[PDB]
Structures are given as C-alpha cells and as structure tokens.
Design an enzyme around this catalytic site. Structure first.
Site, PDB file in Angstrom:
ATOM      1  N   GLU A  71       0.838  -1.191   0.000  1.00  0.00           N
ATOM      2  CA  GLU A  71       0.000   0.000   0.000  1.00  0.00           C
ATOM      3  C   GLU A  71       0.875   1.244   0.000  1.00  0.00           C
ATOM      4  OE1 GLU A  71      -2.018  -0.287   3.740  1.00  0.00           O
ATOM      5  OE2 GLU A  71      -3.149  -2.077   3.169  1.00  0.00           O
ATOM      6  N   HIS A  80       4.553   0.533   2.068  1.00  0.00           N
ATOM      7  CA  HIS A  80       4.692  -0.429   3.150  1.00  0.00           C
ATOM      8  C   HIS A  80       3.929  -1.689   2.774  1.00  0.00           C
ATOM      9  CE1 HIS A  80       0.919   1.708   4.288  1.00  0.00           C
ATOM     10  NE2 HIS A  80       0.528   0.484   4.595  1.00  0.00           N
ATOM     11  N   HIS A  82       2.058  -4.976   4.043  1.00  0.00           N
ATOM     12  CA  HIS A  82       1.438  -5.723   5.126  1.00  0.00           C
ATOM     13  C   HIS A  82       1.643  -7.212   4.891  1.00  0.00           C
ATOM     14  CE1 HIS A  82      -0.490  -2.832   7.745  1.00  0.00           C
ATOM     15  NE2 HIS A  82      -0.890  -2.142   6.692  1.00  0.00           N
ATOM     16  N   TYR A 140      -9.729  -5.638   7.720  1.00  0.00           N
ATOM     17  CA  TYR A 140      -8.964  -4.438   7.405  1.00  0.00           C
ATOM     18  C   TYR A 140      -8.348  -4.496   6.014  1.00  0.00           C
ATOM     19  CZ  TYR A 140      -5.326  -0.841   7.825  1.00  0.00           C
ATOM     20  OH  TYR A 140      -4.500   0.239   7.619  1.00  0.00           O
TER      21      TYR A 140
END
Length: 174
Positions: A71, A80, A82, A140
């Site tokens: 993202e 970054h 995830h 999320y």
C-alpha cells in the site's frame, strides 16, 4: 493461525531498480484494478516476484499460507507491505529471519545499491507475536480500495482471486 507484520519500502529503494526489476516477465492481472504504472507497477512486480518464489519455496516457509498487501504510505512518499503468513515450519523463533530473508533475497536481484528491508512483527500487549492475521485480512486488509492498496498476492482459497478484485473489495467495504 497467521502472523502479522510490516515492511517499509522507502522511495530511495525504487530509484535503485535495475533491468531485472523492469524487464519482469510475470503477468499482473489488472482486468479489475487500476492501471499499474511507475513505482506502483514496480512494487506490484516485486510483490508478485516474492510470492512466486514462495509458492515453490522450501524449509520453514514450505506449506505456509501467505497474504501480502503493498500500500501507499498514508502521509508520505514510499510504500509499506502488510505481511500475513503462517505455516507448520514457521514459528516465533524464525518468523522474522524467514520473512526478512525471503523479501530481501528477491530484492537483491532487482537493485543497483545495497538495500535491506526490516520486518517488524505485530506484537500483543505482552510482546508475543500476534496470531490474528486472517481476521486482520478480513476486517482491514480486504477493505482497502485501489490505489490505496496498490497490489496484493495470496495463496489462501477465497482470497486467491478476490484480493486483486476492485469490485470485490468495494463489497467487503459495504
């Protein structure tokens, strides 16, 4: 079940890209995505490169379930990643070293300068590694809409196709 962590990719790393990064031969299916160009495509290539080597990897990472999401940094330049991963060979004593080895071994092949990514695992209140990664994906990660999420790779059934589907991601939001 699944660990959680983050790798930061400063924008200086994108500048060191060599021809192996640019001349990638792998397919980025953006039929239901935003056009991937410039560093967004470079990071999508990198994320696809790391997953490709992982699907046929050995050692503690063999037979592991993964879900990687690159993202844009919310307030700055850079990206970054995830990182959600878990498996029989993967435990708290080798998670950081395995994730850092995997992502960096691929990155070394694609850059002109000496760079290293640092893996930072999600920690509970008592310092133990978090193990709610699948629910982190569900509550999320899958609720992001491109190009907030730039690219995504996974080998988990159900996300195998939905994770890079903009129309499906808008469904997880609603």
């Amino acid at each position: 079940e699944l660990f959680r962590g983050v790798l930061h990719i400063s924008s200086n790393i994108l500048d060191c890209a060599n021809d192996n990064w640019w001349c990638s031969m792998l397919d980025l299916d953006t039929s239901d995505w935003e056009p991937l160009t410039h560093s967004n495509r470079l990071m999508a290539i990198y994320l696809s490169n790391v997953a490709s080597r992982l699907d046929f990897t050995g050692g503690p990472l063999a037979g592991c379930l993964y879900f990687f999401q690159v993202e844009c940094n919310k307030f700055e330049e850079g990206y970054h990643i995830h990182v959600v991963i878990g498996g029989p060979g993967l435990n708290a004593r080798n998670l950081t070293v395995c994730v850092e080895g995997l992502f960096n071994n691929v990155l070394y092949h694609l850059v002109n300068e000496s760079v290293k990514l640092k893996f930072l695992p999600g920690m509970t209140t008592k310092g133990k590694y978090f193990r709610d990664g699948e629910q982190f994906i569900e509550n999320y990660l899958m609720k992001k809409i491109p190009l907030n999420v730039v690219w995504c790779v996974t080998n988990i059934d159900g996300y195998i196709d939905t994770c890079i589907s903009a129309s499906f991601r808008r469904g997880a939001c609603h």
